[PDB]
Amino acid sequence: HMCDAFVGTWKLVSSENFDDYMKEVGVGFATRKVAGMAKPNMIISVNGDVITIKSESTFKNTEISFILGQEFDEVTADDRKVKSTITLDGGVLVHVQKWDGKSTTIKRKREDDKLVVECVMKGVTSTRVYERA
Numbered sequence: 001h002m003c004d005a006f007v008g009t010w011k012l013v014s015s016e017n018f019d020d021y022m023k024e025v026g027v028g029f030a031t032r033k034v035a036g037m038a039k040p041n042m043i044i045s046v047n048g049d050v051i052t053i054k055s056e057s058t059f060k061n062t063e064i065s066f067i068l069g070q071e072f073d074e075v076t077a078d079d080r081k082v083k084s085t086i087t088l089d090g091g092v093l094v095h096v097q098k099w100d101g102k103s104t105t106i107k108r109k110r111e112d113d114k115l116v117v118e119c120v121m122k123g124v125t126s127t128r129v130y131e132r133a
């Protein structure tokens with residue numbers, strides 16, 4: 001139920017530092033350039049204990065379904081195969097992706113009428129803001 005504030009269709013409206021975050025993660029040039037152009041929709045739904053987050057774009061469509069606290073396999077939009085765990089911490093969805101001894105954290109938070117996504121890899125943070133579509 002507190003997860004209700006996330007449900008819906010969200011469209012990217014701004015992005016800051018995403019190229020440098022992608023570089024830090026290890027995304028190659030071509031994928032950075034093409035991925036960086038996209039204005040994805042993020043579609044969030046809940047059925048019972050299962051949360052589904054889909055991203056749809058010109059570049060790639062991705063979909064994950066998960067139970068909070070329960071690790072799962074994810075193939076990311078940049079084609080990493082990762083092990084992911086998503087929890088709710090103080091009203092924020094915290095998504096940790098682990099692969100090859102590395103880790104990145106993606107936070108999704110509701111702020112005003114936006115969904116704000118903060119992505120961190122080592123010292124590099126990117127902020128992506130989505131609005132209802």
Ligand SMILES: Cc1c(C2CCCC2)nc(N(C)C(C)C)c(-c2nnn[nH]2)c1-c1ccccc1
Nearest residue numbers: 022025035038040055057059060077078117119
């Ligand atoms: C490539 C990519 C990445 C990876 C870049 C480096 C590591 C993660 N993360 C995303 N985030 C952070 C999601 C998890 C919120 C999105 C993304 N942006 N909106 N939805 N998905 C995209 C993306 C998807 C399709 C079109 C362009 C961009």
